[PDB]
Amino acid sequence: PGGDMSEPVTQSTLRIVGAFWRLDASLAFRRHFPAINWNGSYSLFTSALDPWYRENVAEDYPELRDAISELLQREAGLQEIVQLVGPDALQDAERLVIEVGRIIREDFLQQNAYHEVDAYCSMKKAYGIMKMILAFYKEAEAAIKRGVSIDEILQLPVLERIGRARYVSEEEFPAYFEEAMKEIQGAFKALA
Amino acid sequence: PGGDMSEPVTQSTLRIVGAFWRLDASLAFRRHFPAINWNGSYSLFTSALDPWYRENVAEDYPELRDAISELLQREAGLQEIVQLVGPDALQDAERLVIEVGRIIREDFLQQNAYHEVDAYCSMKKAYGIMKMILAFYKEAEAAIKRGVSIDEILQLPVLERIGRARYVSEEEFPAYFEEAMKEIQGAFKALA
Amino acid sequence: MAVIADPETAQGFRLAGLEGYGASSAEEAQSLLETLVERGGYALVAVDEALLPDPERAVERLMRGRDLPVLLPIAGLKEAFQGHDVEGYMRELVRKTIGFDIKL
Amino acid sequence: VSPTRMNLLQRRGQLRLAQKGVDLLKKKRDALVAEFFGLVREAMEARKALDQAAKEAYAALLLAQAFDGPEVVAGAALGVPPLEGVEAEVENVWGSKVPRLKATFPDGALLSPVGTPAYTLEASRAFRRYAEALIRVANTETRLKKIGEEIKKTTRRVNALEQVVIPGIRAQIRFIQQVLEQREREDTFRLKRIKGKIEAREAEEE
Amino acid sequence: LTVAEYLAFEHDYHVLVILTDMTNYCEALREIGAAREEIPGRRGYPGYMYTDLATIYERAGVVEGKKGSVTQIPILSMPDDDRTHPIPDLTGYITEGQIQLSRELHRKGIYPPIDPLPSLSRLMNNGVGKGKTREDHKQVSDQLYSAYANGVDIRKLVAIIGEDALTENDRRYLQFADAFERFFINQGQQNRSIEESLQIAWALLSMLPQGELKRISKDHIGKYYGQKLEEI
């Protein structure tokens, strides 16, 4: 009642369920869906499902998932400073963390339930999107470590490619993923 | 609960008690014992006890106690300046009150509960210690306006004499006190 | 790039390849600096303390959005040879910047 | 704001964030003050060098203008074009841009430097050293003033957080706590009434 | 108050009643009410606390055709200095103004630490002037309030833009505020006559130019302006 998560039913359910998917009113207001509050959510099944992920999705899938979670935790830590001094007062590495977190939220976490393609996502498609995002972040951190301005990294068209990778059909996705990986390598090769 | 004095028990207690001895963990962390925060502490009995002090220890005693309290307040008023810039950037007048506050703390306020003679202090011994401290402060304030810089004053042996006043026994204190008063008077006369 | 000063020293600046004005009074200096600032293209302008204590307080109404022209107070001609206190200058600059005017 | 336990926890988290921001800003201010105090020594050294250059320039100028006619030296200076000898490039200082004056020292671009006076050419080098000292002092002083204004902004932010923000959040926390305690007291009253009714029914008509 | 009413309205006494701590009275009232299973009010205090306090406060006053009077000065300690607390809030709804002590002034060593800015006497306008204290009282009080408020808000502005950027008038108002706090508010155990207090007020006002005294008419400025604070 009133969105108060401290109410008896929510607290009672908190003590017995294995996964807790907390929805956020602020995310729903800005039409960010599924509107899961990442900070308030958790799952207790992550460790037990790792062998299945290795056998069925990819051997390094848990490492990619942990990398994404670590990036989100770092972005959440930096947001406290951002809300104090603004995003432009950060260094280039921290600003890159902020922008990669925004990319993760808008291009990976977001999912349109009423879209003809984005409604369903396979495990391998999600793995490919995560791999593209992490490769882009690694290339961007390498470029930033040698003086490349962040303001021009964000203008690369591969950013839009990753952003629109959501709306690619399942059978067309592997070719799109290969092309996106090649473009990720090439664009950061071009930046000196 | 967590040191929050706003608790109704603490508010009810402070309405009826005549003294509050604020014990502080920060002072104990700095190895200042007893860890009594003189800024937050207070006593409502001083005015009623003043005639007893004038009759039994010294007619001057209330004035000395107020002078020492005022020196402590002046030292506390400089904390933000000393936080912003080092003590060496202070004027000689401000550096003098900082050093005198240090002397007051480490030689009057601190007391070793396990020491053989320092565990107990009579009113007259404490009065003599404040006499020595205030006489030294007045002599140093005169020397400052005589053009004497701070760091020759800080090297005087009277510093160590006042520092050792705590550990002299009760029956030996009067002679030590008169000798210290004489040599504090002498040490500043010979100073350039 | 300009320096305004007394005429006997205004020659040296154009003698070094720079350009300089000869000024005689504080009002002349103020008119000179407004008549220099209204137009852009000047990296540095200098006026001595003798006829202007605060060069920036004379044109702040124009530099507050386009502060590219750097301004600097310099010593007077008599004060040049006889010297002047830089400790006092340091303390007044501290007063203008941090404001405490408390240092040694 | 609607008083709820979740909202109370949100306000308390905001208070914690504000306190941590105050601490972070104070550390930033300490770093800025250390930089400022190094830069003030650099500025005093630059100012002393400027004083020395001013002496060595105007002493030479006075001698040259007496040994040689002022008209000859004036014409020699007028043969030199008033060119743009320096460039202003914006150096970055703590997230802000300040112009650094880079003097090209265009000795080859000063056309027609030859002159009949005996010590004018030395005065030209002396006055160019004077201009170099000028640009050095200006370069140090612009950075010094920018650091000073950064310290001012940081102190303004610290004061605002310590005076307006934190007490306000504390007041909202107190208000929400009072409302929640009021609701608890009303619930206790209702439960007492319910227990009284149960006892009355049981003990009078079972 | 029964004794006060008896004295005032049966023997023509002018009675001043001082109630030392109404906070303790309100705690006792909360005890008594909660002992009787009543529905609690804003912070556990009984819902009828306003009426109970009114039955005490409303007994002061003056009666037509009688020479006596009853004047009340309730004293209460605002918990955690919160004036919206039920005790001061309900007291303010009944009383004719309030005198608020300032913790900042007390911290600065001023006694009595009365803050004039949040203080008010509602019945002041009908009790001062010619034939009561003296004519220029009201205008002097208004000018003092205006000048002190200006000094306080200028002082607040100084913390942002610094002291070097203020005009001469702002500096003069800062001097007035400092001298006001040090001499008018700070009086220790002195028993000052109303004439002495007006003299000190006029000496403080003399630190401001005559043209700044918009509240005071020029007749009173001619009569009283121009006295030095140097006189003790």
PDB file of C-alpha atoms in Angstrom, chain A residues 47-187:
ATOM      1  CA  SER A  47      25.857 -19.730  -7.834  1.00  0.00           C
ATOM      2  CA  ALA A  48      23.869 -22.956  -8.205  1.00  0.00           C
ATOM      3  CA  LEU A  49      23.094 -22.217 -11.863  1.00  0.00           C
ATOM      4  CA  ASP A  50      26.689 -21.548 -12.948  1.00  0.00           C
ATOM      5  CA  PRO A  51      27.493 -25.085 -14.240  1.00  0.00           C
ATOM      6  CA  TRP A  52      24.374 -24.984 -16.409  1.00  0.00           C
ATOM      7  CA  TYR A  53      25.417 -21.598 -17.794  1.00  0.00           C
ATOM      8  CA  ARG A  54      28.889 -22.915 -18.603  1.00  0.00           C
ATOM      9  CA  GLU A  55      27.532 -26.016 -20.338  1.00  0.00           C
ATOM     10  CA  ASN A  56      24.668 -24.353 -22.219  1.00  0.00           C
ATOM     11  CA  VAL A  57      25.476 -20.671 -22.831  1.00  0.00           C
ATOM     12  CA  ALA A  58      29.246 -20.123 -22.692  1.00  0.00           C
ATOM     13  CA  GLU A  59      32.171 -21.150 -20.517  1.00  0.00           C
ATOM     14  CA  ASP A  60      32.871 -17.520 -19.576  1.00  0.00           C
ATOM     15  CA  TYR A  61      29.248 -16.391 -19.176  1.00  0.00           C
ATOM     16  CA  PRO A  62      29.445 -16.103 -15.346  1.00  0.00           C
ATOM     17  CA  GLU A  63      32.543 -13.923 -15.688  1.00  0.00           C
ATOM     18  CA  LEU A  64      30.735 -11.599 -18.106  1.00  0.00           C
ATOM     19  CA  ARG A  65      27.727 -11.412 -15.786  1.00  0.00           C
ATOM     20  CA  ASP A  66      29.981 -10.604 -12.828  1.00  0.00           C
ATOM     21  CA  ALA A  67      31.754  -7.940 -14.892  1.00  0.00           C
ATOM     22  CA  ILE A  68      28.418  -6.318 -15.755  1.00  0.00           C
ATOM     23  CA  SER A  69      27.368  -6.441 -12.097  1.00  0.00           C
ATOM     24  CA  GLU A  70      30.679  -4.881 -11.030  1.00  0.00           C
ATOM     25  CA  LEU A  71      30.279  -2.105 -13.596  1.00  0.00           C
ATOM     26  CA  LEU A  72      26.786  -1.397 -12.270  1.00  0.00           C
ATOM     27  CA  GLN A  73      28.083  -1.324  -8.682  1.00  0.00           C
ATOM     28  CA  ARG A  74      30.833   1.108  -9.701  1.00  0.00           C
ATOM     29  CA  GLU A  75      28.300   3.320 -11.485  1.00  0.00           C
ATOM     30  CA  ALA A  76      26.082   3.294  -8.393  1.00  0.00           C
ATOM     31  CA  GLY A  77      29.071   4.334  -6.301  1.00  0.00           C
ATOM     32  CA  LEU A  78      29.963   7.166  -8.676  1.00  0.00           C
ATOM     33  CA  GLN A  79      26.371   8.421  -8.843  1.00  0.00           C
ATOM     34  CA  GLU A  80      26.709   9.726  -5.282  1.00  0.00           C
ATOM     35  CA  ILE A  81      29.517  12.027  -6.443  1.00  0.00           C
ATOM     36  CA  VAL A  82      27.637  12.848  -9.655  1.00  0.00           C
ATOM     37  CA  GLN A  83      24.584  14.060  -7.733  1.00  0.00           C
ATOM     38  CA  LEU A  84      26.926  16.275  -5.683  1.00  0.00           C
ATOM     39  CA  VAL A  85      29.201  17.909  -8.279  1.00  0.00           C
ATOM     40  CA  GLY A  86      27.677  16.943 -11.632  1.00  0.00           C
ATOM     41  CA  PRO A  87      28.858  14.480 -14.277  1.00  0.00           C
ATOM     42  CA  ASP A  88      31.252  16.985 -15.876  1.00  0.00           C
ATOM     43  CA  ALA A  89      33.385  17.260 -12.717  1.00  0.00           C
ATOM     44  CA  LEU A  90      34.491  13.618 -12.904  1.00  0.00           C
ATOM     45  CA  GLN A  91      37.671  12.351 -14.499  1.00  0.00           C
ATOM     46  CA  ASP A  92      37.557  10.650 -17.883  1.00  0.00           C
ATOM     47  CA  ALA A  93      37.675   7.134 -16.417  1.00  0.00           C
ATOM     48  CA  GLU A  94      34.797   7.800 -14.013  1.00  0.00           C
ATOM     49  CA  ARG A  95      32.810   9.556 -16.739  1.00  0.00           C
ATOM     50  CA  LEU A  96      33.408   6.506 -18.934  1.00  0.00           C
ATOM     51  CA  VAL A  97      32.051   4.317 -16.139  1.00  0.00           C
ATOM     52  CA  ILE A  98      28.968   6.547 -15.961  1.00  0.00           C
ATOM     53  CA  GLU A  99      28.396   6.415 -19.724  1.00  0.00           C
ATOM     54  CA  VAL A 100      28.916   2.642 -19.888  1.00  0.00           C
ATOM     55  CA  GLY A 101      26.420   2.235 -17.054  1.00  0.00           C
ATOM     56  CA  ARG A 102      23.939   4.336 -19.011  1.00  0.00           C
ATOM     57  CA  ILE A 103      24.598   2.137 -22.056  1.00  0.00           C
ATOM     58  CA  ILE A 104      23.993  -0.996 -19.983  1.00  0.00           C
ATOM     59  CA  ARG A 105      20.730   0.377 -18.598  1.00  0.00           C
ATOM     60  CA  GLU A 106      19.356   1.616 -21.919  1.00  0.00           C
ATOM     61  CA  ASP A 107      20.597  -1.156 -24.232  1.00  0.00           C
ATOM     62  CA  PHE A 108      20.747  -4.282 -22.060  1.00  0.00           C
ATOM     63  CA  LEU A 109      18.519  -3.865 -19.010  1.00  0.00           C
ATOM     64  CA  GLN A 110      15.698  -2.215 -20.958  1.00  0.00           C
ATOM     65  CA  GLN A 111      13.285  -4.530 -22.763  1.00  0.00           C
ATOM     66  CA  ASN A 112       9.993  -3.668 -24.469  1.00  0.00           C
ATOM     67  CA  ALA A 113       7.396  -6.333 -23.688  1.00  0.00           C
ATOM     68  CA  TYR A 114       5.142  -5.113 -26.510  1.00  0.00           C
ATOM     69  CA  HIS A 115       7.817  -4.973 -29.211  1.00  0.00           C
ATOM     70  CA  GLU A 116       7.573  -7.562 -31.972  1.00  0.00           C
ATOM     71  CA  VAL A 117      11.203  -8.652 -31.418  1.00  0.00           C
ATOM     72  CA  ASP A 118      12.396  -7.243 -28.091  1.00  0.00           C
ATOM     73  CA  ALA A 119       9.616  -9.016 -26.166  1.00  0.00           C
ATOM     74  CA  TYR A 120      11.625 -12.259 -25.991  1.00  0.00           C
ATOM     75  CA  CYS A 121      15.398 -12.556 -25.644  1.00  0.00           C
ATOM     76  CA  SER A 122      17.417 -15.754 -25.823  1.00  0.00           C
ATOM     77  CA  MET A 123      20.292 -16.444 -23.456  1.00  0.00           C
ATOM     78  CA  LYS A 124      22.832 -16.366 -26.290  1.00  0.00           C
ATOM     79  CA  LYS A 125      21.529 -13.043 -27.614  1.00  0.00           C
ATOM     80  CA  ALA A 126      21.848 -11.521 -24.137  1.00  0.00           C
ATOM     81  CA  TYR A 127      25.335 -13.009 -23.852  1.00  0.00           C
ATOM     82  CA  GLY A 128      26.276 -11.431 -27.176  1.00  0.00           C
ATOM     83  CA  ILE A 129      24.972  -8.026 -26.119  1.00  0.00           C
ATOM     84  CA  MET A 130      26.943  -8.275 -22.869  1.00  0.00           C
ATOM     85  CA  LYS A 131      30.069  -9.278 -24.793  1.00  0.00           C
ATOM     86  CA  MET A 132      29.692  -6.317 -27.158  1.00  0.00           C
ATOM     87  CA  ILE A 133      29.198  -3.893 -24.262  1.00  0.00           C
ATOM     88  CA  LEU A 134      32.205  -5.229 -22.356  1.00  0.00           C
ATOM     89  CA  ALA A 135      34.444  -5.179 -25.440  1.00  0.00           C
ATOM     90  CA  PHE A 136      33.419  -1.580 -26.107  1.00  0.00           C
ATOM     91  CA  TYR A 137      34.156  -0.653 -22.495  1.00  0.00           C
ATOM     92  CA  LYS A 138      37.584  -2.308 -22.589  1.00  0.00           C
ATOM     93  CA  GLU A 139      38.502  -0.568 -25.840  1.00  0.00           C
ATOM     94  CA  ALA A 140      37.255   2.757 -24.461  1.00  0.00           C
ATOM     95  CA  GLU A 141      39.291   2.381 -21.268  1.00  0.00           C
ATOM     96  CA  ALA A 142      42.370   1.562 -23.356  1.00  0.00           C
ATOM     97  CA  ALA A 143      41.795   4.632 -25.543  1.00  0.00           C
ATOM     98  CA  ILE A 144      41.174   6.878 -22.524  1.00  0.00           C
ATOM     99  CA  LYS A 145      44.423   5.633 -20.987  1.00  0.00           C
ATOM    100  CA  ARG A 146      46.226   7.199 -23.986  1.00  0.00           C
ATOM    101  CA  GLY A 147      44.575  10.615 -24.007  1.00  0.00           C
ATOM    102  CA  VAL A 148      41.601  10.034 -26.317  1.00  0.00           C
ATOM    103  CA  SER A 149      38.812  12.428 -25.381  1.00  0.00           C
ATOM    104  CA  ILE A 150      35.662  10.795 -24.031  1.00  0.00           C
ATOM    105  CA  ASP A 151      33.480  13.366 -25.816  1.00  0.00           C
ATOM    106  CA  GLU A 152      34.364  11.781 -29.180  1.00  0.00           C
ATOM    107  CA  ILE A 153      34.144   8.162 -27.995  1.00  0.00           C
ATOM    108  CA  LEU A 154      30.458   8.709 -27.221  1.00  0.00           C
ATOM    109  CA  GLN A 155      29.882   9.946 -30.784  1.00  0.00           C
ATOM    110  CA  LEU A 156      30.990   6.702 -32.438  1.00  0.00           C
ATOM    111  CA  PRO A 157      28.217   5.096 -34.542  1.00  0.00           C
ATOM    112  CA  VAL A 158      28.971   1.759 -32.871  1.00  0.00           C
ATOM    113  CA  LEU A 159      27.291   3.266 -29.807  1.00  0.00           C
ATOM    114  CA  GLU A 160      24.062   3.473 -31.807  1.00  0.00           C
ATOM    115  CA  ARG A 161      24.708  -0.030 -33.154  1.00  0.00           C
ATOM    116  CA  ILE A 162      24.897  -1.420 -29.617  1.00  0.00           C
ATOM    117  CA  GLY A 163      21.850   0.636 -28.662  1.00  0.00           C
ATOM    118  CA  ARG A 164      19.775  -0.864 -31.468  1.00  0.00           C
ATOM    119  CA  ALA A 165      21.118  -4.419 -31.103  1.00  0.00           C
ATOM    120  CA  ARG A 166      18.042  -5.044 -28.918  1.00  0.00           C
ATOM    121  CA  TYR A 167      15.649  -4.967 -31.873  1.00  0.00           C
ATOM    122  CA  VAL A 168      17.507  -7.564 -33.976  1.00  0.00           C
ATOM    123  CA  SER A 169      15.706 -10.855 -34.548  1.00  0.00           C
ATOM    124  CA  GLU A 170      17.083 -14.074 -33.093  1.00  0.00           C
ATOM    125  CA  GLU A 171      18.132 -15.766 -36.343  1.00  0.00           C
ATOM    126  CA  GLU A 172      19.613 -12.531 -37.718  1.00  0.00           C
ATOM    127  CA  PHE A 173      21.405 -11.759 -34.451  1.00  0.00           C
ATOM    128  CA  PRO A 174      24.677 -13.756 -34.880  1.00  0.00           C
ATOM    129  CA  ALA A 175      25.612 -11.932 -38.095  1.00  0.00           C
ATOM    130  CA  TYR A 176      24.750  -8.593 -36.482  1.00  0.00           C
ATOM    131  CA  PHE A 177      26.909  -9.553 -33.495  1.00  0.00           C
ATOM    132  CA  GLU A 178      29.885 -10.479 -35.676  1.00  0.00           C
ATOM    133  CA  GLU A 179      29.587  -7.230 -37.628  1.00  0.00           C
ATOM    134  CA  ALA A 180      29.238  -5.244 -34.393  1.00  0.00           C
ATOM    135  CA  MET A 181      32.346  -6.899 -32.943  1.00  0.00           C
ATOM    136  CA  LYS A 182      34.320  -6.078 -36.089  1.00  0.00           C
ATOM    137  CA  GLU A 183      33.093  -2.479 -35.961  1.00  0.00           C
ATOM    138  CA  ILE A 184      33.983  -2.240 -32.258  1.00  0.00           C
ATOM    139  CA  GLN A 185      37.539  -3.274 -33.089  1.00  0.00           C
ATOM    140  CA  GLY A 186      37.779  -1.003 -36.129  1.00  0.00           C
ATOM    141  CA  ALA A 187      36.346   2.177 -34.610  1.00  0.00           C
TER     142      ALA A 187
END
